[PDB]
Protein backbone atom coordinates (compact mmCIF):
# COMPACT_ATOMS: atom_id res chain seq x y z
CA UNK A 1 0.00 0.00 0.00
CA UNK A 2 0.87 3.71 -0.34
CA UNK A 3 3.60 4.07 -2.91
CA UNK A 4 4.96 7.29 -4.46
CA UNK A 5 7.49 8.46 -7.07
CA UNK A 6 10.18 11.03 -6.47
CA UNK A 7 13.70 12.09 -7.28
CA UNK A 8 16.79 11.89 -5.10
CA UNK A 9 18.27 15.21 -4.03
CA UNK A 10 21.25 14.07 -1.97
CA UNK A 11 22.25 12.81 1.43
CA UNK A 12 22.46 14.70 4.73
CA UNK A 13 22.22 13.92 8.45
CA UNK A 14 19.61 14.59 11.19
CA UNK A 15 19.78 14.22 14.96
CA UNK A 16 17.12 11.96 16.40
CA UNK A 17 15.54 12.19 19.79
CA UNK A 18 18.19 11.24 22.36
CA UNK A 19 20.51 12.68 19.67
CA UNK A 20 21.82 9.97 17.35
CA UNK A 21 23.34 10.70 13.95
CA UNK A 22 20.77 9.55 11.40
CA UNK A 23 22.10 9.60 7.81
CA UNK A 24 19.16 10.45 5.59
CA UNK A 25 18.41 10.69 1.89
CA UNK A 26 16.26 13.60 0.75
CA UNK A 27 13.61 12.55 -1.76
CA UNK A 28 11.52 15.21 -3.49
CA UNK A 29 8.06 13.90 -4.37
CA UNK A 30 5.90 16.56 -6.00
CA UNK A 31 3.05 16.57 -8.53
CA UNK A 32 2.34 12.88 -8.19
CA UNK A 33 -0.98 12.15 -9.91
CA UNK A 34 -2.94 8.96 -10.53
CA UNK A 35 -3.22 8.66 -14.31
CA UNK A 36 -4.84 5.23 -14.73
CA UNK A 37 -6.49 2.47 -12.74
CA UNK A 38 -5.57 -1.00 -13.97
CA UNK A 39 -8.36 -3.43 -13.13
CA UNK A 40 -8.56 -7.22 -13.32
CA UNK A 41 -11.58 -7.22 -15.61
CA UNK A 42 -9.89 -4.88 -18.09
CA UNK A 43 -6.15 -5.53 -17.66
CA UNK A 44 -5.99 -8.85 -15.81
CA UNK A 45 -4.55 -7.30 -12.65
CA UNK A 46 -5.15 -4.34 -10.35
CA UNK A 47 -2.68 -1.47 -10.08
CA UNK A 48 -2.58 2.31 -10.03
CA UNK A 49 -0.54 4.17 -12.64
CA UNK A 50 1.21 7.18 -11.10
CA UNK A 51 2.72 10.03 -13.09
CA UNK A 52 5.44 12.20 -11.59
CA UNK A 53 7.04 15.58 -12.32
CA UNK A 54 5.63 18.00 -14.88
CA UNK A 55 6.31 18.10 -18.59
CA UNK A 56 5.60 21.22 -20.58
CA UNK A 57 2.57 21.10 -22.82
CA UNK A 58 2.66 19.89 -26.40
CA UNK A 59 4.21 22.29 -28.89
CA UNK A 60 4.76 22.16 -32.62
CA UNK A 61 8.31 21.12 -33.55
CA UNK A 62 9.50 19.99 -30.14
CA UNK A 63 13.01 18.57 -30.21
CA UNK A 64 13.35 16.91 -26.81
CA UNK A 65 11.54 15.03 -24.06
CA UNK A 66 10.77 18.37 -22.37
CA UNK A 67 7.48 18.60 -24.27
CA UNK A 68 4.74 16.02 -24.28
CA UNK A 69 3.99 14.41 -27.59
CA UNK A 70 0.41 13.92 -28.68
CA UNK A 71 0.10 10.32 -27.36
CA UNK A 72 1.25 11.40 -23.90
CA UNK A 73 -0.83 14.57 -23.76
CA UNK A 74 -3.95 12.65 -24.74
CA UNK A 75 -3.19 9.96 -22.17
CA UNK A 76 -2.73 12.50 -19.38
CA UNK A 77 -5.77 14.50 -20.54
CA UNK A 78 -8.08 11.52 -20.04
CA UNK A 79 -7.42 12.15 -16.39
CA UNK A 80 -7.29 15.86 -15.61
CA UNK A 81 -3.57 16.44 -15.17
CA UNK A 82 -0.51 17.85 -16.86
CA UNK A 83 1.83 15.59 -18.83
CA UNK A 84 4.27 13.76 -16.60
CA UNK A 85 7.92 12.90 -17.10
CA UNK A 86 8.03 9.62 -15.14
CA UNK A 87 5.14 7.16 -15.26
CA UNK A 88 5.21 4.03 -13.11
CA UNK A 89 2.56 1.83 -11.59
CA UNK A 90 2.02 0.24 -8.20
CA UNK A 91 0.51 -3.16 -7.37
CA UNK A 92 0.79 -3.13 -3.58
CA UNK A 93 -1.85 -0.40 -3.31
CA UNK A 94 -5.60 -0.93 -3.06
CA UNK A 95 -7.04 0.45 -6.28
CA UNK A 96 -10.41 1.28 -4.71
CA UNK A 97 -8.69 3.61 -2.24
CA UNK A 98 -7.48 5.72 -5.17
CA UNK A 99 -9.34 7.73 -7.79
CA UNK A 100 -8.15 8.70 -11.26
CA UNK A 101 -6.81 12.24 -11.41
CA UNK A 102 -6.24 12.48 -7.67
CA UNK A 103 -2.95 13.73 -6.25
CA UNK A 104 -0.73 11.27 -4.40
CA UNK A 105 0.51 13.55 -1.63
CA UNK A 106 3.69 13.27 0.38
CA UNK A 107 1.99 12.81 3.74
CA UNK A 108 0.52 9.46 2.70
CA UNK A 109 3.70 8.35 4.49
CA UNK A 110 4.12 8.94 8.22
CA UNK A 111 7.41 9.01 10.09
CA UNK A 112 8.31 5.49 11.14
CA UNK A 113 6.89 3.74 8.09
CA UNK A 114 9.06 0.90 6.79
CA UNK A 115 9.57 1.15 3.06
CA UNK A 116 11.21 -0.41 0.01
CA UNK A 117 12.96 1.98 -2.37
CA UNK A 118 13.68 1.10 -6.00
CA UNK A 119 16.12 2.99 -8.19
CA UNK A 120 18.52 2.55 -11.09
CA UNK A 121 22.04 2.24 -9.75
CA UNK A 122 24.90 4.54 -10.66
CA UNK A 123 26.56 3.77 -13.96
CA UNK A 124 30.16 2.59 -14.05
CA UNK A 125 30.63 1.61 -17.69
CA UNK A 126 33.08 -0.98 -18.97
CA UNK A 127 34.73 -2.41 -15.85
CA UNK A 128 37.03 -5.33 -15.22
CA UNK A 129 36.75 -8.50 -13.22
CA UNK A 130 38.13 -7.30 -9.91
CA UNK A 131 35.83 -4.29 -9.68
CA UNK A 132 32.78 -5.68 -11.45
CA UNK A 133 32.85 -8.98 -9.56
CA UNK A 134 34.97 -8.42 -6.47
CA UNK A 135 37.53 -10.97 -7.61
CA UNK A 136 40.93 -11.03 -5.97
CA UNK A 137 43.97 -9.97 -7.97
CA UNK A 138 47.17 -11.83 -8.70
CA UNK A 139 50.54 -11.05 -7.13
CA UNK A 140 51.92 -7.61 -7.88
CA UNK A 141 55.56 -8.76 -7.69
CA UNK A 142 57.54 -12.03 -7.54
CA UNK A 143 57.83 -12.14 -11.31
CA UNK A 144 54.05 -12.10 -11.73
CA UNK A 145 52.40 -11.25 -15.04
CA UNK A 146 48.88 -11.71 -13.59
CA UNK A 147 47.57 -8.54 -11.99
CA UNK A 148 43.92 -7.79 -12.80
CA UNK A 149 42.96 -10.52 -15.27
CA UNK A 150 40.16 -12.98 -14.58
CA UNK A 151 41.47 -16.39 -13.70
CA UNK A 152 40.78 -19.58 -15.62
CA UNK A 153 37.56 -19.57 -17.61
CA UNK A 154 37.07 -23.31 -17.32
CA UNK A 155 38.57 -26.78 -17.13
CA UNK A 156 40.39 -28.77 -19.81
CA UNK A 157 39.10 -31.02 -22.60
CA UNK A 158 36.27 -32.16 -20.31
CA UNK A 159 33.96 -29.19 -20.82
CA UNK A 160 35.89 -27.90 -23.85
CA UNK A 161 33.79 -24.78 -23.35
CA UNK A 162 33.06 -21.93 -20.97
CA UNK A 163 29.92 -22.30 -18.86
CA UNK A 164 27.21 -19.66 -18.87
CA UNK A 165 27.66 -16.94 -16.26
CA UNK A 166 31.45 -16.99 -15.89
CA UNK A 167 31.79 -13.50 -14.34
CA UNK A 168 33.85 -11.82 -17.05
CA UNK A 169 34.45 -8.06 -17.60
CA UNK A 170 31.67 -5.82 -18.88
CA UNK A 171 29.37 -2.84 -18.34
CA UNK A 172 28.93 -2.21 -14.61
CA UNK A 173 26.01 -0.34 -13.09
CA UNK A 174 22.72 1.02 -14.30
CA UNK A 175 20.61 -1.84 -12.95
CA UNK A 176 17.28 -1.77 -11.15
CA UNK A 177 18.03 -2.17 -7.44
CA UNK A 178 15.57 -2.41 -4.55
CA UNK A 179 16.73 -1.63 -1.03
CA UNK A 180 14.48 -3.19 1.59
CA UNK A 181 13.29 -2.20 5.07
CA UNK A 182 14.33 1.43 5.06
CA UNK A 183 12.32 3.77 7.27
CA UNK A 184 11.05 7.29 6.70
CA UNK A 185 12.48 9.77 9.20
CA UNK A 186 10.18 12.72 8.57
CA UNK A 187 7.80 14.15 6.00
CA UNK A 188 7.86 17.80 4.92
CA UNK A 189 4.54 18.74 3.33
CA UNK A 190 5.46 22.29 2.25
CA UNK A 191 8.77 21.24 0.70
CA UNK A 192 7.19 17.92 -0.40
CA UNK A 193 10.19 16.00 0.90
CA UNK A 194 10.51 12.53 2.43
CA UNK A 195 13.60 11.92 4.53
CA UNK A 196 14.44 8.22 4.25
CA UNK A 197 16.95 6.62 6.58
CA UNK A 198 20.18 5.58 4.90
CA UNK A 199 21.05 5.66 1.21
CA UNK A 200 19.14 4.64 -1.90
CA UNK A 201 20.44 3.54 -5.33
CA UNK A 202 21.08 6.01 -8.11
CA UNK A 203 22.70 9.30 -9.01
CA UNK A 204 21.57 12.60 -7.59
CA UNK A 205 18.44 13.86 -9.35
CA UNK A 206 17.66 10.32 -10.54
CA UNK A 207 14.34 8.60 -9.89
CA UNK A 208 13.31 6.61 -6.83
CA UNK A 209 10.11 4.67 -6.16
CA UNK A 210 9.05 4.39 -2.52
CA UNK A 211 6.47 1.82 -1.51
CA UNK A 212 5.45 -0.07 1.62
CA UNK A 213 7.82 -2.84 2.69
CA UNK A 214 6.68 -6.14 1.20
CA UNK A 215 8.10 -7.90 4.25
CA UNK B 1 -12.74 -62.79 4.55
CA UNK B 2 -14.14 -64.36 7.70
CA UNK B 3 -14.34 -60.84 9.11
CA UNK B 4 -16.25 -59.73 6.03
CA UNK B 5 -18.67 -62.61 5.52
CA UNK B 6 -18.93 -64.68 8.70
CA UNK B 7 -19.66 -61.84 11.14
CA UNK B 8 -22.66 -60.03 9.64
CA UNK B 9 -23.78 -56.58 10.69
CA UNK B 10 -26.52 -56.03 13.26
CA UNK B 11 -28.09 -52.54 13.21
CA UNK B 12 -29.84 -51.62 16.47
CA UNK B 13 -32.48 -48.87 16.08
CA UNK B 14 -30.33 -47.10 13.47
CA UNK B 15 -31.07 -45.88 9.94
CA UNK B 16 -28.64 -47.09 7.27
CA UNK B 17 -29.16 -45.82 3.71
CA UNK B 18 -27.36 -47.92 1.08
CA UNK B 19 -27.59 -45.02 -1.36
CA UNK B 20 -25.86 -46.73 -4.25
CA UNK B 21 -22.27 -47.15 -3.11
CA UNK B 22 -22.34 -44.08 -0.86
CA UNK B 23 -23.51 -45.26 2.57
CA UNK B 24 -25.13 -43.04 5.19
CA UNK B 25 -25.55 -44.19 8.79
CA UNK B 26 -27.41 -42.11 11.38
CA UNK B 27 -28.55 -42.76 14.92
CA UNK B 28 -28.70 -41.23 18.39
CA UNK B 29 -25.43 -39.28 18.13
CA UNK B 30 -25.22 -38.13 14.53
CA UNK B 31 -24.87 -39.15 10.90
CA UNK B 32 -21.84 -40.63 9.12
CA UNK B 33 -21.33 -40.78 5.34
CA UNK B 34 -18.59 -42.90 3.77
CA UNK B 35 -18.10 -44.23 0.25
CA UNK B 36 -17.40 -47.95 0.43
CA UNK B 37 -15.80 -50.28 -2.10
CA UNK B 38 -17.63 -50.16 -5.42
CA UNK B 39 -17.57 -53.81 -6.49
CA UNK B 40 -19.01 -55.15 -3.24
CA UNK B 41 -22.70 -55.99 -2.82
CA UNK B 42 -24.83 -55.33 0.25
CA UNK B 43 -27.85 -57.32 1.47
CA UNK B 44 -30.03 -55.67 4.11
CA UNK B 45 -32.61 -57.70 6.05
CA UNK B 46 -34.66 -56.55 9.05
CA UNK B 47 -32.03 -54.82 11.22
CA UNK B 48 -29.17 -56.86 9.68
CA UNK B 49 -26.58 -56.09 6.99
CA UNK B 50 -24.32 -58.52 5.13
CA UNK B 51 -21.42 -57.90 2.74
CA UNK B 52 -20.88 -60.17 -0.29
CA UNK B 53 -17.72 -60.18 -2.49
CA UNK B 54 -17.94 -60.97 -6.27
CA UNK B 55 -14.90 -63.20 -7.06
CA UNK B 56 -12.61 -64.85 -4.47
CA UNK B 57 -9.68 -62.99 -6.14
CA UNK B 58 -7.20 -61.84 -3.39
CA UNK B 59 -8.16 -58.16 -4.04
CA UNK B 60 -11.95 -58.76 -3.76
CA UNK B 61 -11.46 -60.94 -0.66
CA UNK B 62 -9.37 -58.05 0.85
CA UNK B 63 -11.79 -55.14 0.17
CA UNK B 64 -14.64 -57.33 1.46
CA UNK B 65 -13.13 -57.68 4.91
CA UNK B 66 -12.18 -54.02 4.93
CA UNK B 67 -15.61 -52.62 3.97
CA UNK B 68 -17.51 -54.86 6.33
CA UNK B 69 -15.59 -53.70 9.41
CA UNK B 70 -15.73 -50.10 8.20
CA UNK B 71 -19.55 -50.17 8.20
CA UNK B 72 -19.60 -52.05 11.50
CA UNK B 73 -17.52 -49.18 12.88
CA UNK B 74 -20.11 -46.65 11.72
CA UNK B 75 -23.05 -48.46 13.28
CA UNK B 76 -21.23 -49.14 16.55
CA UNK B 77 -19.99 -45.56 16.86
CA UNK B 78 -23.31 -43.97 16.00
CA UNK B 79 -25.27 -46.27 18.33
CA UNK B 80 -22.72 -46.61 21.14
CA UNK B 81 -19.97 -44.05 20.50
CA UNK B 82 -16.19 -44.07 20.77
CA UNK B 83 -14.07 -42.73 23.64
CA UNK B 84 -10.31 -42.55 24.20
CA UNK B 85 -8.83 -41.57 27.56
CA UNK B 86 -5.31 -40.23 28.03
CA UNK B 87 -3.41 -40.01 31.30
CA UNK B 88 -0.92 -37.23 32.04
CA UNK B 89 2.01 -38.34 34.20
CA UNK B 90 4.49 -35.84 35.57
CA UNK B 91 4.84 -33.27 38.35
CA UNK B 92 3.17 -30.11 37.08
CA UNK B 93 1.45 -31.66 34.06
CA UNK B 94 -2.09 -30.28 33.86
CA UNK B 95 -4.97 -30.20 31.38
CA UNK B 96 -7.65 -27.51 31.27
CA UNK B 97 -10.31 -26.49 28.79
CA UNK B 98 -10.47 -23.06 27.18
CA UNK B 99 -13.76 -23.27 25.25
CA UNK B 100 -13.96 -25.82 22.42
CA UNK B 101 -10.17 -26.08 22.95
CA UNK B 102 -7.82 -28.03 25.21
CA UNK B 103 -4.77 -26.47 26.90
CA UNK B 104 -1.90 -28.55 28.29
CA UNK B 105 1.01 -27.52 30.53
CA UNK B 106 3.47 -30.39 30.16
CA UNK B 107 6.66 -28.58 31.18
CA UNK B 108 7.41 -26.85 27.89
CA UNK B 109 7.81 -23.20 29.00
CA UNK B 110 4.74 -22.61 26.82
CA UNK B 111 1.16 -23.97 26.92
CA UNK B 112 -0.02 -26.18 24.07
CA UNK B 113 -3.50 -25.73 22.57
CA UNK B 114 -5.49 -28.28 20.52
CA UNK B 115 -8.72 -26.94 19.06
CA UNK B 116 -11.56 -29.42 18.96
CA UNK B 117 -13.29 -30.20 15.69
CA UNK B 118 -16.80 -31.07 14.56
CA UNK B 119 -18.33 -34.22 16.08
CA UNK B 120 -15.59 -34.31 18.76
CA UNK B 121 -15.77 -33.44 22.46
CA UNK B 122 -12.94 -33.05 24.96
CA UNK B 123 -13.23 -33.29 28.71
CA UNK B 124 -10.92 -33.21 31.72
CA UNK B 125 -11.10 -34.74 35.20
CA UNK B 126 -8.73 -34.33 38.16
CA UNK B 127 -6.71 -32.06 35.85
CA UNK B 128 -5.02 -35.20 34.51
CA UNK B 129 -7.34 -37.56 32.62
CA UNK B 130 -8.12 -36.12 29.19
CA UNK B 131 -11.08 -37.64 27.35
CA UNK B 132 -11.86 -37.55 23.62
CA UNK B 133 -15.30 -38.68 22.51
CA UNK B 134 -16.95 -38.91 19.12
CA UNK B 135 -18.84 -41.04 16.64
CA UNK B 136 -16.04 -41.65 14.15
CA UNK B 137 -13.33 -44.06 15.27
CA UNK B 138 -10.91 -42.87 12.58
CA UNK B 139 -11.08 -39.32 13.94
CA UNK B 140 -11.14 -40.00 17.68
CA UNK B 141 -8.01 -42.09 17.16
CA UNK B 142 -6.39 -39.30 15.17
CA UNK B 143 -7.14 -36.70 17.83
CA UNK B 144 -5.91 -38.95 20.63
CA UNK B 145 -2.67 -39.54 18.73
CA UNK B 146 -2.26 -35.80 18.18
CA UNK B 147 -2.75 -35.08 21.89
CA UNK B 148 -0.31 -37.76 23.03
CA UNK B 149 2.23 -36.68 20.40
CA UNK B 150 2.51 -33.34 22.22
CA UNK B 151 4.65 -35.23 24.74
CA UNK B 152 4.69 -39.02 24.43
CA UNK B 153 5.86 -40.98 27.48
CA UNK B 154 9.54 -41.19 28.34
CA UNK B 155 11.25 -44.41 29.46
CA UNK B 156 12.98 -43.30 32.67
CA UNK B 157 10.02 -42.09 34.75
CA UNK B 158 7.04 -42.49 32.41
CA UNK B 159 6.21 -38.78 32.27
CA UNK B 160 4.06 -37.74 29.32
CA UNK B 161 0.63 -38.05 27.72
CA UNK B 162 0.07 -41.81 27.55
CA UNK B 163 -2.92 -43.86 26.52
CA UNK B 164 -4.68 -45.21 29.58
CA UNK B 165 -3.68 -48.82 30.04
CA UNK B 166 -0.72 -48.46 27.68
CA UNK B 167 2.39 -50.39 28.62
CA UNK B 168 5.39 -48.08 28.96
CA UNK B 169 8.76 -49.78 28.68
CA UNK B 170 10.57 -48.40 31.72
CA UNK B 171 14.36 -48.15 31.86
CA UNK B 172 16.49 -47.58 34.97
CA UNK B 173 18.99 -44.88 34.06
CA UNK B 174 20.86 -43.56 37.08
CA UNK B 175 21.95 -40.13 38.30
Amino acid sequence: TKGILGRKIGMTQVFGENGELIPVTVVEAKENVVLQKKTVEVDGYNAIQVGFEDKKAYKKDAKSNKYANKPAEGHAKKADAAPKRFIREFRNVDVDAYEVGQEVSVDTFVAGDVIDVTGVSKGKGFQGAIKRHGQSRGPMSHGSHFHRAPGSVGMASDASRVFKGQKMPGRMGGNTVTVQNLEVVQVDTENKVILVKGNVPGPKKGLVEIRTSIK
Amino acid sequence: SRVGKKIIDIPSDVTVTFDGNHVTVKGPKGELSRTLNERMTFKQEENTIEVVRPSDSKEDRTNHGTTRALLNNMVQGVSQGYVKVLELVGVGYRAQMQGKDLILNVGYSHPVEIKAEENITFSVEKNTVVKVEGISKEQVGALASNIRSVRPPEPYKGKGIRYQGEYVRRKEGKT
Partner: protein, 122 residues
Protein backbone atom coordinates in the same frame (compact mmCIF):
# COMPACT_ATOMS: atom_id res chain seq x y z
CA UNK C 1 42.11 -2.05 13.38
CA UNK C 2 44.30 -4.65 15.07
CA UNK C 3 45.10 -7.76 13.03
CA UNK C 4 47.51 -10.63 13.42
CA UNK C 5 51.23 -9.81 13.70
CA UNK C 6 50.23 -6.38 15.04
CA UNK C 7 52.42 -5.09 17.83
CA UNK C 8 50.71 -3.50 20.83
CA UNK C 9 51.91 -1.75 23.94
CA UNK C 10 50.52 -3.21 27.12
CA UNK C 11 48.92 -0.73 29.50
CA UNK C 12 49.15 -2.45 32.88
CA UNK C 13 51.75 -3.53 35.42
CA UNK C 14 51.25 -7.24 34.70
CA UNK C 15 54.82 -7.66 33.49
CA UNK C 16 54.41 -7.55 29.73
CA UNK C 17 55.52 -4.38 27.89
CA UNK C 18 54.75 -5.41 24.27
CA UNK C 19 52.69 -8.25 22.66
CA UNK C 20 52.12 -9.48 19.07
CA UNK C 21 48.60 -10.72 18.14
CA UNK C 22 48.36 -14.40 17.09
CA UNK C 23 44.56 -14.28 16.47
CA UNK C 24 41.45 -12.07 16.88
CA UNK C 25 38.78 -14.13 18.71
CA UNK C 26 35.13 -14.13 17.75
CA UNK C 27 34.68 -16.10 14.54
CA UNK C 28 35.98 -17.74 11.39
CA UNK C 29 37.43 -15.21 8.98
CA UNK C 30 37.49 -12.47 11.60
CA UNK C 31 40.43 -10.27 10.66
CA UNK C 32 40.52 -7.04 12.68
CA UNK C 33 39.74 -6.00 16.23
CA UNK C 34 39.04 -2.68 17.93
CA UNK C 35 38.48 -1.53 21.50
CA UNK C 36 36.56 -4.13 23.47
CA UNK C 37 37.66 -7.05 21.28
CA UNK C 38 39.72 -9.84 22.81
CA UNK C 39 42.85 -11.20 21.14
CA UNK C 40 45.31 -14.00 21.80
CA UNK C 41 48.89 -12.80 21.71
CA UNK C 42 52.49 -13.60 22.53
CA UNK C 43 54.42 -11.23 24.76
CA UNK C 44 57.57 -9.98 23.05
CA UNK C 45 59.06 -7.73 25.74
CA UNK C 46 58.64 -8.03 29.50
CA UNK C 47 59.82 -6.34 32.66
CA UNK C 48 62.17 -8.35 34.90
CA UNK C 49 59.74 -9.81 37.40
CA UNK C 50 55.97 -9.65 37.26
CA UNK C 51 53.58 -12.52 36.60
CA UNK C 52 53.77 -12.45 32.79
CA UNK C 53 57.08 -13.55 31.26
CA UNK C 54 58.47 -13.22 27.76
CA UNK C 55 57.17 -15.89 25.40
CA UNK C 56 53.85 -16.53 27.15
CA UNK C 57 50.68 -16.95 25.08
CA UNK C 58 47.95 -14.92 26.76
CA UNK C 59 44.57 -13.29 26.25
CA UNK C 60 44.27 -9.53 26.18
CA UNK C 61 41.54 -6.95 25.65
CA UNK C 62 42.16 -4.01 23.36
CA UNK C 63 42.04 -0.52 24.87
CA UNK C 64 42.58 2.75 22.98
CA UNK C 65 43.47 1.89 19.43
CA UNK C 66 44.70 4.62 17.13
CA UNK C 67 42.03 3.72 14.57
CA UNK C 68 39.47 4.83 17.14
CA UNK C 69 35.76 4.16 17.41
CA UNK C 70 32.61 5.85 16.21
CA UNK C 71 29.82 6.49 18.71
CA UNK C 72 26.10 6.42 18.05
CA UNK C 73 25.84 10.23 18.05
CA UNK C 74 28.46 10.57 15.30
CA UNK C 75 31.31 11.45 17.65
CA UNK C 76 34.64 9.72 17.13
CA UNK C 77 37.45 9.01 19.57
CA UNK C 78 41.01 8.21 18.46
CA UNK C 79 44.22 7.66 20.41
CA UNK C 80 47.97 8.00 19.91
CA UNK C 81 48.97 4.37 20.38
CA UNK C 82 47.42 0.94 20.27
CA UNK C 83 47.19 -0.63 23.69
CA UNK C 84 45.96 -3.79 25.37
CA UNK C 85 45.50 -5.26 28.84
CA UNK C 86 46.15 -8.89 29.77
CA UNK C 87 42.96 -10.52 31.09
CA UNK C 88 42.45 -13.55 33.33
CA UNK C 89 39.83 -15.43 31.24
CA UNK C 90 37.09 -13.93 33.44
CA UNK C 91 37.50 -10.58 31.63
CA UNK C 92 39.43 -9.48 34.71
CA UNK C 93 42.90 -7.97 34.59
CA UNK C 94 46.17 -9.59 35.68
CA UNK C 95 47.73 -6.30 36.67
CA UNK C 96 46.55 -4.08 39.48
CA UNK C 97 47.60 -0.65 38.19
CA UNK C 98 46.17 -0.02 34.71
CA UNK C 99 47.83 3.02 33.12
CA UNK C 100 46.75 5.41 30.39
CA UNK C 101 43.35 6.60 29.23
CA UNK C 102 40.69 4.02 28.43
CA UNK C 103 37.75 4.20 26.05
CA UNK C 104 34.24 4.14 27.51
CA UNK C 105 33.21 1.38 25.07
CA UNK C 106 34.79 -1.17 27.42
CA UNK C 107 32.06 -0.52 29.99
CA UNK C 108 29.62 -2.38 27.74
CA UNK C 109 31.78 -5.48 27.36
CA UNK C 110 31.70 -5.95 31.16
CA UNK C 111 35.34 -5.03 31.67
CA UNK C 112 34.27 -3.11 34.74
CA UNK C 113 37.38 -4.02 36.73
CA UNK C 114 39.50 -2.52 33.94
CA UNK C 115 37.22 0.51 33.53
CA UNK C 116 37.22 1.35 37.25
CA UNK C 117 41.00 0.89 37.56
CA UNK C 118 41.85 3.33 34.76
CA UNK C 119 42.79 6.93 35.63
CA UNK C 120 40.59 8.28 32.83
CA UNK C 121 37.62 6.74 31.03
CA UNK C 122 36.60 8.62 27.91
Amino acid sequence: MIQQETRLKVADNSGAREVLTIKVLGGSGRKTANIGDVIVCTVKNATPGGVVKKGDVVKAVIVRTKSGVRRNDGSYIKFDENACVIIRDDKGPRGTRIFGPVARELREGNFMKIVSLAPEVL
